[PDB]
Structures are given as C-alpha cells and as structure tokens.
Design a protein around this ligand. Structure first.
Ligand SMILES: COc1ccc(-c2cccc(S(=O)(=O)NC(=O)[C@@H](N)CS)c2)cn1
Ligand SMILES: [Ca+2]
Ligand SMILES: [Ca+2]
Ligand SMILES: [Zn+2]
Length: 413
C-alpha cells in the first residue's frame, strides 16, 4: 500500500521460550496465542493529526513486542495497519488549523513514519490509507445489502447506508457491553443514535451519503464516503482473511469500533469470530484524558527527541508499566527510564559478565506471559546489578544481553 518506514536490523537470539499468552478483551481472560506458520495482525492505525503522541507510541510499541516475540519464536508475520486519512475529527482539526485536510494528513503521516523509525518499531507489511480502500468498502457494503444485514435509510436527500446491529446474533461478544452502555459510548464516540429512520439506534453507518462541503466517492448506492468501522473491517478482511490472529488498537476502540468491524466481517463471511484475540492499550495524558492538542496534555515523541531523550528511553519508560495497567508519563518515569538505560548500557559494556542463560530465559517467559515488561525489566535490572557489583567471566554475555534486549524489546544499548 502506502510507503511505511524502514525496519531496523533484527538480531536472532538462539533458543526459544514459551509461546505467547495474551489477554483477550473479548473473552476477558488470558488465552494462548496460537498462529499458523504465518502469524497475522491488524492494528488500527492513526488518524493523522497530533503527530506521534505517547498514547500512539504506547499502542504501537505494545504490538511491536508481539511482532518481535513472534519473530523470536520462528513465525513469519503479516502486519497490516491502516491510516484513517479521511475522518470527521481530521476534518475538524484541519478547519481549526486553517489547513487542508490532505496537507495535514500527509504531513502527520510523515511525522508518524519518522517517529516509528526513531523508535525502531517494525513496520507493517501493508500500510493502507482509508481513501485507498474505498473499493473494498464498496464491495463489502454491496454484500451486506444483498443479505439484508444492511439497508438504505428512507431519506431521499441523504440516503445513508446502515448496518443492522442485529445482523449477527453474537453482536456484543467483543465488548460485553449492554445496550445502555453502548448507547452512551456510541453517541460519544462518533455514532448517530438519534438519526431519523434507523431501525435500531445502534445501527452503524456504512456509507454516508454525499453532503455539501464534504469529499465523496462514487458507488452503486450513490455518491458518498465510508463509515469508520467498515473501513478497518474491509482492509483487515481483504488483506488477511478470516485467519486473523490479533485485532489491536487503542483502548477506546473496544466499542464501538472493534465491535462493529468484527460484526461487519462476521456477517459477510458467515464466520463466528473475526479475530482470535482483541488487544487494547494506550496511554492517557497528565489529566487522565487521551492526549490531544486542544487539551494541552499532548506529549509528542518528536518533542522528547528534541529535548535529547533517547528513543530507547521512551520505550523503557513506556515498558515500565504493563499495557493493561493505567500507564502515565511523568518526569519521574523519564528519569527512571534514563537511569535504567544507562545502567543497562554499563553492564553490557563490561569486558565480561555472569552467564546470561537464565536472564534471557526469564525475559522470554515474562514477555510470553501477557507481555509482562515490568518483570522482564526487573530481571534485566537484576542481571545488570549482579554483573556490576560482583562481575563474571563470560566475555560473550554482555553482547548477548544487548542483542536480546535489541531483538525482543527493540531497545538499542
Ligand atoms: C485511552 O488512551 C488512548 C486512546 C487512544 C489512543 C490511540 C492509539 C492509536 C491511534 C489513535 S488515533 O486516534 O490516532 N486513531 C484511531 O483511533 C483510528 N485511526 C483507528 S482506525 C488513538 C491511545 N491511547
Ligand atoms: Ca529464534
Ligand atoms: Ca575474569
Ligand atoms: Zn480501525
């Protein structure tokens, strides 16, 4: 698809640890991740404004660990990620900024590429802009209308196309939310529960009819533009198929976004479950809200880099907390990450060190146990403190620890 970014070198660490076990948002429990020879991952990409904030970084670094752990286990990986380059919040920001929405989106997607490369994040194999996926959205809305899962609303001026929330009997399995909770979150996260003519308040926009002052594309259901959830449903389905191991993204995507994107794909395919695991993570700003320029809580990766922060310290700072805990950035967090990075660099610069077999095995076990980076970091702290306090006589373990931290954590010592 679009140009993404360059991968760093990935060293190969001899040996293997346990297979990855991951919490599944849908079943609300840790379950084994069991891919075929090619493991498949779709992670919802950015809406291209506000650069790469630390919420972005926390999300895509978490899936970088999965990517890296799959490669460590010998899997081939198919990583697909989108860009929501046409989007109502994007239009709003562009109008507020006095800039064209495509100039804004192109510029911010480029800043994302640069931050992802600086953070040494492994790139997706297919990087797909929403505007380049219109045809696949159209093909799949055609299928949804043919089966009756979708309908055109009775509105001559604005004949929007909607997906029936009861098109699948299992609608709601991924979030587990009841109707009242869905109504609240649907309204506050882009849905239109009060739109006249819908069969159910929870019916989701599939194709928004042409409006004055809005970009539009041709289609057999009239000129318009895609709904948000069917964009990612169609990209994931057409690129990966039904054998999706992981659907991932930020915390707020549990509902409505991933609930409907799964329901759209299960309805067209007849399959019971779109993805085997649903994985959510992110990070709030200082005020407990998602990071946004208009809140004055926005911390950008490029800001940290301009202040002289090592990108590996950003990774370590984000990894100091578990991805399903409420992570928060602060000066204290940055300071411990800087001190941890310097400590690790000291030990891996030693002429000789104690055997690294146990700590590498322990790091692999902790990462395999629902990405327990706090305990993996603590195990490395312990090996480093033993090497620096008491020493050892393996001339290879300093480099071997550095290469493992590189391959598995993306941290460059
Ligand atoms: C609760 O804290 C959070 C909340 C949200 C996020 C986050 C992560 C990645 C991308 C985006 S996003 O807003 O840029 N884009 C989209 O959600 C769509 N393009 C998906 S298709 C937000 C992080 N931390
Ligand atoms: Ca290996
Ligand atoms: Ca010696
Ligand atoms: Zn998405």
């Amino acid at each position: 698809g679009m140009q993404s970014w360059s991968a760093p070198a990935i060293p190969v660490v001899p040996g293997r640890g346990p297979a990855l076990r991951l919490f599944d948002s849908a079943d609300r429990q840790v379950r084994p991740v069991t891919p075929g020879p090619t493991a498949t991952m779709y992670v919802c990409g950015i809406t291209p404004y506000d650069a790469t904030h630390l919420g972005h970084a926390a999300t895509y670094l978490t899936f970088d660990l999965v990517h890296r752990l799959w490669l460590d286990a010998g899997h081939t990986v198919q990583y697909v990620q989108n860009v929501t380059d046409v989007d109502d919040p994007l239009f709003e920001r562009a109008e507020r900024d006095g800039i064209d929405w495509r100039t804004l989106g192109d510029r911010e997607t480029q800043l994302f590429r640069e931050d992802m490369a600086a953070l040494r994040v492994l790139p997706p194999h297919d990087y797909v802009a929403a505007t380049d996926a219109i045809a696949e959205v159209v093909e799949m809305v055609e299928k949804l209308l043919a089966s009756g899962a979708a309908y055109i609303v009775e509105d001559a001026e604005y004949p929007d196309v909607y997906f029936r929330a009861d098109a699948t009997a299992q609608f709601g399995y991924e979030s587990g939310y009841d109707r009242d909770t869905m109504l609240t979150l649907f309204a506050e996260r882009g849905g239109d529960p009060d739109r006249p003519g819908k069969s159910d308040q929870l019916d989701a926009l599939l194709w928004r009819a042409e409006r004055p002052g809005e970009p539009s594309w041709p289609s057999p259901f009239g000129r318009g533009r895609p709904g948000w959830h069917v964009e990612c449903s169609a990209i994931a389905l057409t690129r990966i198929g039904t054998g999706l191991d992981i659907q991932g993204g930020g915390s707020d995507l549990i509902f409505p976004h991933h609930e409907y994107s799964a329901a759209h794909a299960e309805s067209v395919t007849g399959e019971r479950r779109f993805a085997r695991h649903y994985v959510h993570t992110g990070m709030i700003g200082w005020d407990g809200h998602k990071m946004s320029k208009s809140r004055g809580n926005l911390v950008l990766v490029s800001q940290l880099r301009a202040q002289g922060v090592d990108p590996s310290a950003i990774r370590l700072g984000l990894f100091s907390g578990h991805y399903r805990e409420d992570r928060f950035w602060s000066n204290e967090v940055l300071d411990e990450a800087n001190a941890r990075l310097a400590r690790w660099r000291s030990a891996t610069a030693l002429p000789e060190a104690p055997d690294a077999t146990d700590v590498i095995a322990r790091v692999r076990q902790y990462l395999a146990d629902d990405l327990d980076t706090p305990k993996a970091l603590a195990a490395l702290d312990g090996w480093c403190t033993d090497a620096l306090s008491y020493g050892g006589h393996d001339t290879e373990s300093p480099r071997l620890v550095a290469t493992t931290v590189d391959a598995l954590l993306g941290v460059d010592l």
